[PDB]
Design a protein around this motif. Structure first.
Motif, PDB file in Angstrom:
ATOM      1  N   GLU A 160       5.367   1.932  11.247  1.00 23.85           N
ATOM      2  CA  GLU A 160       4.066   2.308  10.699  1.00 23.85           C
ATOM      3  C   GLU A 160       3.640   1.102   9.872  1.00 23.85           C
ATOM      4  OE1 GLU A 160       4.152   6.063   8.507  1.00 23.85           O
ATOM      5  OE2 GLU A 160       2.039   6.534   8.857  1.00 23.85           O
ATOM      6  N   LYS A 161       2.348   0.805   9.838  1.00 20.18           N
ATOM      7  CA  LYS A 161       1.905  -0.388   9.128  1.00 20.18           C
ATOM      8  C   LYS A 161       1.600  -0.073   7.666  1.00 20.18           C
ATOM      9  CE  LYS A 161      -0.646  -3.163  11.582  1.00 20.18           C
ATOM     10  NZ  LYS A 161      -1.902  -3.721  12.168  1.00 20.18           N
ATOM     11  N   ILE A 162       2.576  -0.347   6.807  1.00 19.86           N
ATOM     12  CA  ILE A 162       2.502  -0.027   5.386  1.00 19.86           C
ATOM     13  C   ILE A 162       1.646  -0.978   4.546  1.00 19.86           C
ATOM     14  CG2 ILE A 162       3.829   0.200   3.283  1.00 19.86           C
ATOM     15  CD1 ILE A 162       6.226   0.938   4.985  1.00 19.86           C
ATOM     16  N   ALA A 163       2.104  -2.215   4.381  1.00 22.14           N
ATOM     17  CA  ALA A 163       1.546  -3.108   3.373  1.00 22.14           C
ATOM     18  C   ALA A 163       0.682  -4.217   3.951  1.00 22.14           C
ATOM     19  CB  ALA A 163       2.657  -3.702   2.568  1.00 22.14           C
ATOM     20  N   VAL A 164       0.302  -5.166   3.094  1.00 17.60           N
ATOM     21  CA  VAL A 164      -0.481  -6.341   3.484  1.00 17.60           C
ATOM     22  C   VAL A 164      -0.312  -7.458   2.449  1.00 17.60           C
ATOM     23  CG1 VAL A 164      -2.510  -5.247   2.459  1.00 17.60           C
ATOM     24  CG2 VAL A 164      -2.791  -7.277   3.850  1.00 17.60           C
ATOM     25  N   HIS A 165      -0.128  -8.682   2.924  1.00 20.69           N
ATOM     26  CA  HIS A 165      -0.013  -9.820   2.020  1.00 20.69           C
ATOM     27  C   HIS A 165      -0.777 -11.030   2.534  1.00 20.69           C
ATOM     28  CE1 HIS A 165       3.100 -10.225   5.037  1.00 20.69           C
ATOM     29  NE2 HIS A 165       3.412 -11.447   4.644  1.00 20.69           N
ATOM     30  N   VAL A 166      -0.824 -12.069   1.711  1.00 20.37           N
ATOM     31  CA  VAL A 166      -1.518 -13.290   2.084  1.00 20.37           C
ATOM     32  C   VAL A 166      -0.856 -14.491   1.402  1.00 20.37           C
ATOM     33  CG1 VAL A 166      -3.208 -12.989   0.232  1.00 20.37           C
ATOM     34  CG2 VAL A 166      -3.785 -14.396   2.230  1.00 20.37           C
TER      35      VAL A 166
ATOM     36  N   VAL B 101       0.812  -1.213   0.000  1.00 19.78           N
ATOM     37  CA  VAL B 101       0.000   0.000   0.000  1.00 19.78           C
ATOM     38  C   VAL B 101       0.842   1.257   0.000  1.00 19.78           C
ATOM     39  CG1 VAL B 101      -1.517   1.444   1.394  1.00 19.78           C
ATOM     40  CG2 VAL B 101      -2.064  -0.961   1.017  1.00 19.78           C
ATOM     41  N   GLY B 102       1.751   1.362   0.960  1.00 20.45           N
ATOM     42  CA  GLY B 102       2.607   2.527   1.052  1.00 20.45           C
ATOM     43  C   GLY B 102       2.151   3.545   2.082  1.00 20.45           C
ATOM     44  N   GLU B 103       1.225   3.143   2.949  1.00 18.64           N
ATOM     45  CA  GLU B 103       0.720   4.028   3.995  1.00 18.64           C
ATOM     46  C   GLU B 103      -0.080   3.249   5.014  1.00 18.64           C
ATOM     47  OE1 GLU B 103      -3.584   5.857   3.542  1.00 18.64           O
ATOM     48  OE2 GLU B 103      -2.279   6.829   2.053  1.00 18.64           O
ATOM     49  N   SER B 104      -0.168   3.771   6.232  1.00 17.60           N
ATOM     50  CA  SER B 104      -1.048   3.185   7.235  1.00 17.60           C
ATOM     51  C   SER B 104      -2.353   3.945   7.234  1.00 17.60           C
ATOM     52  CB  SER B 104      -0.421   3.221   8.631  1.00 17.60           C
ATOM     53  OG  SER B 104      -0.522   4.515   9.211  1.00 17.60           O
ATOM     54  N   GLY B 105      -3.361   3.391   7.892  1.00 15.99           N
ATOM     55  CA  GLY B 105      -4.655   4.041   7.950  1.00 15.99           C
ATOM     56  C   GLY B 105      -5.686   3.321   7.112  1.00 15.99           C
ATOM     57  N   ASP B 106      -6.777   4.013   6.801  1.00 11.32           N
ATOM     58  CA  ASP B 106      -7.913   3.379   6.142  1.00 11.32           C
ATOM     59  C   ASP B 106      -7.548   2.688   4.832  1.00 11.32           C
ATOM     60  OD1 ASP B 106     -11.145   3.331   6.067  1.00 11.32           O
ATOM     61  OD2 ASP B 106     -10.365   3.682   4.046  1.00 11.32           O
ATOM     62  N   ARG B 107      -6.585   3.238   4.105  1.00 11.87           N
ATOM     63  CA  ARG B 107      -6.244   2.671   2.809  1.00 11.87           C
ATOM     64  C   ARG B 107      -5.660   1.269   2.979  1.00 11.87           C
ATOM     65  NH1 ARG B 107      -3.145   2.795  -2.212  1.00 11.87           N
ATOM     66  NH2 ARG B 107      -4.616   3.586  -3.801  1.00 11.87           N
ATOM     67  N   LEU B 108      -4.893   1.095   4.044  1.00  5.92           N
ATOM     68  CA  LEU B 108      -4.258  -0.177   4.299  1.00  5.92           C
ATOM     69  C   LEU B 108      -5.314  -1.186   4.731  1.00  5.92           C
ATOM     70  CD1 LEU B 108      -2.990  -1.866   7.016  1.00  5.92           C
ATOM     71  CD2 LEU B 108      -2.080  -2.214   4.706  1.00  5.92           C
TER      72      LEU B 108
ATOM     73  N   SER C 282       2.162  -5.779   7.093  1.00  5.24           N
ATOM     74  CA  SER C 282       3.606  -5.595   7.239  1.00  5.24           C
ATOM     75  C   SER C 282       3.917  -4.253   7.877  1.00  5.24           C
ATOM     76  CB  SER C 282       4.307  -5.687   5.888  1.00  5.24           C
ATOM     77  OG  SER C 282       4.308  -7.008   5.382  1.00  5.24           O
ATOM     78  N   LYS C 283       4.936  -4.211   8.724  1.00  5.15           N
ATOM     79  CA  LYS C 283       5.328  -2.951   9.340  1.00  5.15           C
ATOM     80  C   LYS C 283       6.564  -2.397   8.642  1.00  5.15           C
ATOM     81  CE  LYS C 283       3.619  -2.727  14.196  1.00  5.15           C
ATOM     82  NZ  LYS C 283       3.852  -3.211  15.598  1.00  5.15           N
ATOM     83  N   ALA C 284       6.777  -1.088   8.741  1.00  2.14           N
ATOM     84  CA  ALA C 284       7.925  -0.445   8.106  1.00  2.14           C
ATOM     85  C   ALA C 284       9.256  -0.950   8.663  1.00  2.14           C
ATOM     86  CB  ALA C 284       7.827   1.054   8.270  1.00  2.14           C
ATOM     87  N   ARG C 285      10.191  -1.284   7.779  1.00  2.44           N
ATOM     88  CA  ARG C 285      11.527  -1.681   8.214  1.00  2.44           C
ATOM     89  C   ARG C 285      12.239  -0.509   8.869  1.00  2.44           C
ATOM     90  NH1 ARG C 285      10.636  -6.481   6.396  1.00  2.44           N
ATOM     91  NH2 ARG C 285      12.282  -7.736   5.392  1.00  2.44           N
ATOM     92  N   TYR C 286      12.152   0.655   8.219  1.00  2.98           N
ATOM     93  CA  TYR C 286      12.677   1.918   8.752  1.00  2.98           C
ATOM     94  C   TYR C 286      11.865   3.143   8.310  1.00  2.98           C
ATOM     95  CZ  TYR C 286      15.028   0.888   4.330  1.00  2.98           C
ATOM     96  OH  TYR C 286      15.338   0.474   3.053  1.00  2.98           O
ATOM     97  N   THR C 287      12.490   4.312   8.344  1.00  4.04           N
ATOM     98  CA  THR C 287      11.801   5.537   7.980  1.00  4.04           C
ATOM     99  C   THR C 287      12.371   6.104   6.695  1.00  4.04           C
ATOM    100  OG1 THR C 287      11.335   6.065  10.287  1.00  4.04           O
ATOM    101  CG2 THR C 287      11.171   7.852   8.716  1.00  4.04           C
ATOM    102  N   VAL C 288      11.492   6.611   5.840  1.00  3.44           N
ATOM    103  CA  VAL C 288      11.896   7.397   4.688  1.00  3.44           C
ATOM    104  C   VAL C 288      10.979   8.606   4.534  1.00  3.44           C
ATOM    105  CG1 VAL C 288      12.510   7.390   2.298  1.00  3.44           C
ATOM    106  CG2 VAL C 288      12.514   5.241   3.558  1.00  3.44           C
TER     107      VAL C 288
END
Ligand SMILES: [Mg+2]
Ligand SMILES: [Mg+2]
Ligand SMILES: [Mg+2]
Ligand SMILES: [Mg+2]
Ligand SMILES: [Mg+2]
Ligand SMILES: [Mg+2]
Ligand SMILES: [Mg+2]
Ligand SMILES: [Mg+2]
Ligand SMILES: [Mg+2]
Ligand SMILES: [Mg+2]
Ligand SMILES: [Mg+2]
Ligand SMILES: [Mg+2]
Ligand SMILES: [Mg+2]
Ligand SMILES: [Mg+2]
Ligand SMILES: [Mg+2]
Ligand SMILES: [Mg+2]
Ligand SMILES: [Mg+2]
Ligand SMILES: [Mg+2]
Ligand SMILES: [Mg+2]
Ligand SMILES: [Mg+2]
Ligand SMILES: [Mg+2]
Ligand SMILES: [Mg+2]
Ligand SMILES: [Mg+2]
Ligand SMILES: [Mg+2]
Ligand SMILES: [Mg+2]
Ligand SMILES: [Mg+2]
Ligand SMILES: [Mg+2]
Ligand SMILES: [Mg+2]
Ligand SMILES: [Mg+2]
Ligand SMILES: [Mg+2]
Ligand SMILES: [Mg+2]
Ligand SMILES: [Mg+2]
Ligand SMILES: [Mg+2]
Lengths: 294, 159, 139, 169, 33
Positions: D58-64, D18-25, D43-49
């Motif tokens: 921050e919870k960026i992505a999602v997989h299955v 996704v590239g962001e946390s919140g409703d979109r994720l 998935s949570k962020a490895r680091y900060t950019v």
RNA sequence: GGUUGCGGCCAUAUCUACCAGAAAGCACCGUUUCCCGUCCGAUCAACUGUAGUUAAGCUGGUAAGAGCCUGACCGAGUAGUGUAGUGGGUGACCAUACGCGAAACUCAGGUGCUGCAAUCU
RNA sequence: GAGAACAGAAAUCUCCAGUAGAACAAAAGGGUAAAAGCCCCCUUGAUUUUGAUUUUCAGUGUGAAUACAAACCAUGAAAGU
RNA sequence: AAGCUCGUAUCAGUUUUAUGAGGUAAAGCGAAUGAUUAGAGGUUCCGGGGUCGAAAUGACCUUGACCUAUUCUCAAACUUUAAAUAUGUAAGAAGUCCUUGUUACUUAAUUGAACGUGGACAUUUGAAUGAAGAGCUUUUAGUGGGCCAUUUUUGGUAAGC
């Protein structure tokens, strides 16, 4: 793969213990099993080794020597035909069966067996086979899982309850016996008992021939072709215990062909390795083979 | 300022040998120790409990005590002009038996078992060890051995 | 060496590196002998007695140039340093006879400046696909 | 020869980064759910950019992870979108292969505006029967050389069944 | 339920990896028209 | 002798490539009602041993294979060192006398040994 | 190292390699791989009583540590810790 | 200094035998680490400067970076290896063996662990050399600026520092 090992690598590489490579020994918990309190001296710690192969169950009471671990007495499930179990030889009941066999079979050969009966009753219930004041003390043994996961309701703790019921002080708790409802913080003596007699192979057995005719014909191709009824199951296991507490004593097998024989055939499928001249020769040719730039 | 902490100067002393790091084998836990035994202190830097002081490393002493996971070693320390007595509480990893002693007993058997067939033959015992003596005469043979005489060599440079 | 015989007539290589650092107190009333650990005051190269300082390889006939061209350096070094004619072929090991054996045997393979040797050790597979001429019928 | 060394999908893994946390994720999470019918993993962020917008954990992505015959149908539904054509890239030297799609509505699936449109990564991993040897706790060993998925193998596989094209060089 | 992937690795430093560095890129890059 | 369970020492056992493996064993392998664990019966749990295969694991064999182990008057009595002198040398340093004595180098040999228990053309 | 939409050097995903080249408040050194590291679950042994012991030593004090005894607890299937 | 208990004891600024501990010297760096000269070969399909159809997600390219096999040179706070000299312990009567007592510890266990009764063992009774006797208690003077030489060695250009 072009991640070939540098020669530096191979040289400073420190190998694990042999069986650490094979992944057969947990040397961490081994140490903590084997080690005796120092002021108990030559007193052996005795281990309830319980392993499960694909088709068998292995039980051994073992101690340790520097020159190598030493086994007091060993029982296997693959013996259980002798005591009237010929199907499902790796299920829970087989474990309890085997755990009970090795129970009797040992403190028989320890002569503790007349005293320390165990249970005989077996209505499935948490209890430790403890001692008789003014008399000796029960034979103590410590469960050695191996590398088996400690899951509540695990085949390995079948063998445990088989063995504690056989009268070896083998210290344990309930929460890994089938019938332990964590919500309840309690144990159902009922369920734990069922397994001991195979109630879950029974209930499943009936549901199949009343759900799926063919799938039951295969899972249980044996019982059918042998006319074991679905619910004669308990009486088999129940009658096995008798048979076992009856003559626990180890009978071996009858084996055709002696050691010498067995030997002089089996690995005479051995590849004997080349000798120095022969190998150099093999190579000297190898050169003239490739020798002539192409 | 100066450091004199408890593990100072021990960087190589309490180091584990090349390609012999890691977990400690089980023969160590399978040794039995009695009071009166002679041991050898030699720390194991991975087992940091029951550890000897860097001094006692390389010393050798008697067991005055045996406990759950440790043995009590006596060692005679020199302090000043006079030996003193130190009582160690070390864990089984930091201890061996002294071979030199664990032989002695076998000489004791054998020395007192020469005594077996000694009286049971009536003869002389003669037990005390006697140190290497000067050689006895010999007659070396010239046969297939005509002394092959040598002489000094010249000087030479290979650069 | 160059002017007299030529940029291409020789290989000069300095066989010792200035690795040891030298210190000065630096005495900039004053400060004295108190706290006298010195600052780095330059480097030098520690040399034993018998240790090659310069080495040069050139054509068998250019001998007298290099020598009286090492000599011209000798006068810049503190101490006795000898000049020596090595009985080995070039910056290699092996006495010039012994080198030509391993040359017409093919056991030598022009590398980068130096040269690789055939061994009787490795993987006979790519010992041969490395040093053909040893193994081919050649001559 | 070739009997028990057949060739199967080990697993499929759909991954919407996704590239962001919140409703979109949690919305892209809903999508991955309705496609596997399993419940997905975030998935949570490895680091900060700064120049990406994320901060560590921050919870960026999602997989299955999908295994078995379902993943078989979902891989088909995917190749359905790429008109059964991949490149000689897309194929790991270690047997696996992958591809991507934008707009998840392109493989079955009705619209639902309350959801939106997400793209995703399709990475399927290949192996053989006997892989457990490298996964079991006790006596964990490794595959034989003459076994185990090469890229030539599992691309000439991908032409065989599915019947597709591998392109480029 | 909220399911969290556990990152094995032993790094704690909120810091871009050695595998960062803005050097290495391109004069190229997608530049839509 | 082969194989398995528990081992001792923990590369002569590790590494890379290639081959071969009778029998039993181990195995991969079939299934999800049940106890139990997963995003995913993959792992973990249980059921069958029934449907299938030695393909892999595993065991060996091959290699002027990497590594590792052993030896040698191979280097070398070298480097280093304990003791002696009203020894040599401007000195850096060196030799002699009574003794100890390496490393790299090179060459040759090797590539698991083994305790308990069970089982097997 | 090889691979996957927006995705770029750098987001999330998969595989192969990987003797530790990582990590463990801190100085550095030692130590550690089914751990001593990373994730999780359960917890207060960071508790009670005074004696013995190692270091510095006068073989005084202090700081620190080690092994027991006698309690009361935590945890694990357990040995144990 | 005063003695005291005893009288060849078991002592010793020594060797031998047995068996420990050590990381300095040396050595090593086509071994880990950290330095270091030089080319050679290969990679980039993923830093890149052009030339060639501006053409280039196409070539030949010299340049890096990185890989591989080599080459020259180093380390108090590097290292596989690893001395010499130093350094721990043992070499018996407070010992050995046999029988079998004790107990609340300990063991599945009269099983172990300690501690013993009774019995057997006295030529070299368990290496060499020495022993000018050993062991032990009390109490008190002075001293508590040191300097020198061989060798090992730190700061300093050095010093009768
Ligand atoms: Mg465990
Ligand atoms: Mg329930
Ligand atoms: Mg038999
Ligand atoms: Mg200091
Ligand atoms: Mg290791
Ligand atoms: Mg602590
Ligand atoms: Mg100052
Ligand atoms: Mg300063
Ligand atoms: Mg983490
Ligand atoms: Mg990783
Ligand atoms: Mg055999
Ligand atoms: Mg289910
Ligand atoms: Mg399965
Ligand atoms: Mg399972
Ligand atoms: Mg196996
Ligand atoms: Mg070799
Ligand atoms: Mg000398
Ligand atoms: Mg003199
Ligand atoms: Mg000299
Ligand atoms: Mg990449
Ligand atoms: Mg506190
Ligand atoms: Mg007086
Ligand atoms: Mg030192
Ligand atoms: Mg040196
Ligand atoms: Mg060396
Ligand atoms: Mg180097
Ligand atoms: Mg090499
Ligand atoms: Mg040094
Ligand atoms: Mg004597
Ligand atoms: Mg006085
Ligand atoms: Mg005074
Ligand atoms: Mg003098
Ligand atoms: Mg001196």
């Amino acid at each position: 793969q072009k991640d070939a090992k540098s020669s530096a690598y191979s040289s400073r590489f420190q190998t694990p213990f042999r069986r650490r490579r094979e992944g057969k020994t947990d040397y961490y918990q081994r140490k903590r099993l084997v080690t005796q309190h120092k002021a108990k001296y030559n007193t052996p710690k005795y281990r309830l080794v319980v392993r499960f192969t694909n088709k068998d169950i292995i039980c051994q009471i073992i101690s340790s020597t520097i020159t190598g671990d030493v086994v007091l007495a060993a029982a296997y499930s693959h013996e259980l035909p002798r005591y009237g179990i010929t199907h499902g030889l790796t299920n829970w009941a087989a474990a309890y069966a085997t755990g009970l066999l090795i129970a009797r079979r040992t403190l028989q050969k320890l002569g503790l067996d007349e005293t320390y009966k165990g249970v005989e009753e077996v209505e499935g219930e948490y209890e430790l086979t403890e001692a008789v004041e003014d008399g000796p003390r029960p034979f103590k043994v410590f469960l050695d899982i191996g590398l088996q996961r400690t899951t509540t309701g695990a085949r390995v703790f079948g063998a445990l309850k088989g063995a504690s019921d056989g009268g070896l002080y083998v210290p344990h708790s309930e929460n890994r016996f089938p019938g332990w409802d964590f919500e309840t913080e309690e144990i159902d003596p009922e369920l734990l008992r069922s397994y001991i007699f195979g109630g879950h192979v029974s209930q499943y057995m009936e549901e199949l021939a009343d759900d799926d005719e063919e799938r039951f014909s295969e899972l249980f191709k044996g019982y059918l072709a042998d006319d074991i009824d679905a619910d004669s199951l308990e009486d088999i296991y129940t009658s096995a215990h008798e048979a076992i507490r009856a003559d626990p004593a180890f009978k071996p097998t009858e084996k055709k062909f002696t050691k010498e024989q067995y030997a002089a055939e089996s690995k005479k499928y051995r590849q004997t390795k080349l000798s120095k001249e022969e190998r150099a020769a093999r190579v000297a040719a190898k050169i003239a083979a490739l020798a002539g730039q192409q | 300022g100066k450091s004199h902490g408890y593990r100072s100067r021990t960087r190589y002393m309490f180091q584990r040998d090349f390609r012999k790091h890691g977990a400690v084998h089980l023969s160590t836990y399978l040794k039995v120790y009695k009071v009166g035994d002679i041991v050898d202190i030699k720390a194991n830097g991975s087992i940091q409990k029951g550890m000897p002081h860097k001094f006692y490393q390389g010393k050798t002493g008697v067991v005055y005590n045996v406990t759950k996971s440790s043995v009590g070693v006596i060692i005679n320390k020199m302090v000043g002009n006079r030996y003193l007595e130190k009582r160690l509480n070390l864990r089984v990893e930091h201890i061996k038996h002294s071979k030199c002693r664990q032989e002695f007993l076998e000489r004791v058997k054998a020395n007192a078992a020469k005594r077996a067939e000694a009286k049971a033959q009536g003869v002389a015992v003669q037990l005390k060890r006697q140190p290497a003596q000067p050689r006895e005469s010999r007659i070396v043979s010239t046969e297939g051995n005509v002394p092959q005489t040598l002489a000094p060599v010249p000087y030479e440079t290979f650069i | 060496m160059t002017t007299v015989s030529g940029r291409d007539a020789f290989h000069l290589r300095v066989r010792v590196h200035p690795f040891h650092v030298l210190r000065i107190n630096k005495m900039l009333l004053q400060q004295g002998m108190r706290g006298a650990w010195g600052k780095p005051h330059g480097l030098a190269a520690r040399v034993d007695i018998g240790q090659i300082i310069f080495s040069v390889r050139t054509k068998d006939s250019n001998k007298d140039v290099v020598v009286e061209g090492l000599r011209r350096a000798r006068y810049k070094f503190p101490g006795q340093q000898k000049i020596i004619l090595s009985k080995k072929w070039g910056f290699t090991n092996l006495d010039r006879p012994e080198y030509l054996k391993k040359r017409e045997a093919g056991e030598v393979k022009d590398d980068g400046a130096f040269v690789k040797f055939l061994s009787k050790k490795g993987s006979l597979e790519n010992n041969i696909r490395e040093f053909p001429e040893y193994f081919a019928a050649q001559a | 020869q070739n009997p028990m060394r057949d060739l199967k999908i080990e697993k499929l893994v759909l991954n919407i980064s996704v590239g962001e946390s919140g409703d979109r994720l949690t919305r892209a999470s809903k999508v991955l759910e309705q496609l596997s019918g399993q419940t997905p993993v975030q998935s949570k962020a490895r680091y900060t950019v700064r120049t990406f917008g994320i901060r560590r954990n921050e919870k960026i992505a999602v997989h299955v992870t999908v295994r078995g015959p379902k993943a078989e149908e979902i891989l088909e539904r995917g190749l359905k979108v790429k008109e059964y054509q991949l490149r000689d890239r897309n194929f790991s030297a270690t047997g696996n292969f992958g591809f991507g799609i934008d707009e998840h509505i392109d493989l079955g699936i009705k619209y639902d505006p309350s959801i939106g449109i997400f793209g995703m990564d399709f990475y399927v991993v290949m192996n053989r029967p006997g892989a457990r040897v490298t996964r079991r706790k006790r006596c964990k060993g490794t595959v034989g050389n003459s076994h185990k998925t090469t890229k030539e193998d599992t691309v000439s596989w991908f032409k065989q069944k599915y019947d597709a094209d591998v392109l480029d060089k | 339920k909220e399911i969290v992937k556990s990152n094995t690795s032993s790094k704690k430093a909120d810091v871009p990896p050695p595998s960062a560095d803005p050097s290495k890129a391109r004069k190229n890059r997608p530049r839509p028209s």
